[PDB]
């Protein structure tokens, strides 16, 4: 039973946005007690709406909950900059509470910017230490949501990949990095490796070769 939410949404100050929450088991009903939690950067989660549409006393009147088309919905009207953060829905199934994966809500504060990507191959010194790391550095993107894929030659790589979550730079754009660990033999087995970075539906690719 998986709970699906949009990965990331954007909206302008004074705008309105609706988050939804869907269940893999079927329609979300009032009996599933669908509830909504706000997590601002660095803070504890905060219940905003419980049991479909009940507010807590600290919930701003801008926030409202509903059930729409077998999905739970959280609408924010008159968005204010401080509403930026991650929103999680929560439902229950026969006693087991399940969080959705969360939606990152950006309140737009500057032009959208595609990432710049730099990919470094393993260095001579690391290879000679019988090790190998590819390093993909991703900077200056906005909003701060990105997906990173690796290819060994043309074939997707899963194992050995570790990636950071985007962190805010000084200039309020975002940075992230992704590392692919492999053996010197694997590195020399292939004619190239690539790092693929997807931002707002667009993909940037960098490629390096032994």
């Amino acid at each position: 039973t998986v709970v699906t939410q949009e990965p990331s949404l954007t909206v302008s100050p004074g705008g309105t946005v609706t988050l939804t929450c869907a269940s893999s088991a079927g329609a979300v009903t009032s009996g599933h007690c669908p509830s909504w939690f706000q997590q601002k950067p660095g803070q504890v989660p905060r219940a905003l709406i419980y049991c479909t549409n009940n507010r807590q006393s600290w919930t701003p009147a801008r926030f409202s909950g509903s059930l729409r088309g077998g999905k739970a919905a959280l609408t924010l009207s008159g968005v204010q900059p401080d509403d930026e953060g991650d929103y999680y829905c929560l439902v229950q199934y026969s006693g087991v509470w399940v969080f959705g994966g969360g939606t990152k809500l950006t309140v737009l504060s500057q032009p959208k910017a595609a990432p710049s990507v730099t990919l470094f191959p393993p260095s001579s010194e690391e290879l000679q230490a019988n090790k190998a790391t590819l390093v993909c550095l991703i900077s200056d993107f906005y909003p701060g949501a990105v997906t990173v894929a690796w290819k060994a030659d043309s074939s997707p790589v899963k194992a050995g990949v570790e990636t950071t979550t985007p962190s805010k730079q000084s200039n309020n754009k975002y940075a992230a990095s992704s590392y692919l660990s492999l053996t010197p033999e694997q590195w020399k087995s292939h004619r190239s490796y690539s790092c693929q970075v997807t931002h707002e539906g667009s993909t940037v690719e960098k490629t390096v070769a032994p």
Binding site: P45, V98, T118, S123, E126, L137, T165, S177
Partner: protein, 221 residues
């Protein structure tokens, strides 16, 4: 009604993580469900389980075999125990409370969600005591060059370039925590391409916990 979690902070791999939540402003014997939730750094919220003062417990089925929640009326606390812990269990752990509305003498309902949280406590699961990083040059091929600081623990590493004489165009990235329970990070500097032939670039890496200090020249390979 305030919740305060406590517990070690560092747990060795394959060990047991034990946390306590102290409850104030309400008895544990009240009509509340005492919850545990965690969050891996930068990932989403994951429910762990909840317990009623009578002992009735429910766990996330994904953790069922490893997890034990308990109540201690004698200290007005409840507890979380997680066995066979791996790096995947590094997270912020939160305790939380949800009300149980029972108009009946003995009814359990789901008419309220968790509405009070503790501040949370961070637990890192790693086998390493204190490990200094390996430092490798990332050669240029303006131009970008950098240094990779690989597999250190615990967290605090700082990097400078030419002993701090280079203050412009430096970008040091936050570290990744690997599945091995070690960190790595990189630092990159952008410089004129016509300078690579005459100017020397050295990244200085300081790992405060181990007092390690490494200088790596980065040359155009």
């Amino acid at each position: 009604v305030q919740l305060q979690e406590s517990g070690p902070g560092l747990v060795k791999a394959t060990g047991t993580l034990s946390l306590n939540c102290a409850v104030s402003g309400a008895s544990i014997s009240s009509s509340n469900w005492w919850n545990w939730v965690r969050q891996s750094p930068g990932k989403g919220l994951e429910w762990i389980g909840e317990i009623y003062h009578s002992g009735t417990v429910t766990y996330n089925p994904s953790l069922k075999t490893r997890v034990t929640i308990s109540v201690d009326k004698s200290r007005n606390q409840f507890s979380l125990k997680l066995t066979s812990v791996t790096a995947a269990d590094t997270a912020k752990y939160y305790c939380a409370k949800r009300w149980d509305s029972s108009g009946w003498f003995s009814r359990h309902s789901y008419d309220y969600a968790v509405d009070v949280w503790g501040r949370g406590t961070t637990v890192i699961v790693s086998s390493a005591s204190t490990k200094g990083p390996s430092v490798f040059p990332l050669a240029p091929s303006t131009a970008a060059l950098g240094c990779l600081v690989k597999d250190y623990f615990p967290e605090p590493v700082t990097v400078s370039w030419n002993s701090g004489a280079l203050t412009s165009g430096v970008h040091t990235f936050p570290a990744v925590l690997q599945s091995s329970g070690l960190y790595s990070l990189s630092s990159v500097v952008t410089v004129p391409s016509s300078s690579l032939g005459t100017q020397t670039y050295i990244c200085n890496v300081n790992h405060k916990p181990s007092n390690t200090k490494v200088d790596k020249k980065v040359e155009p390979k």
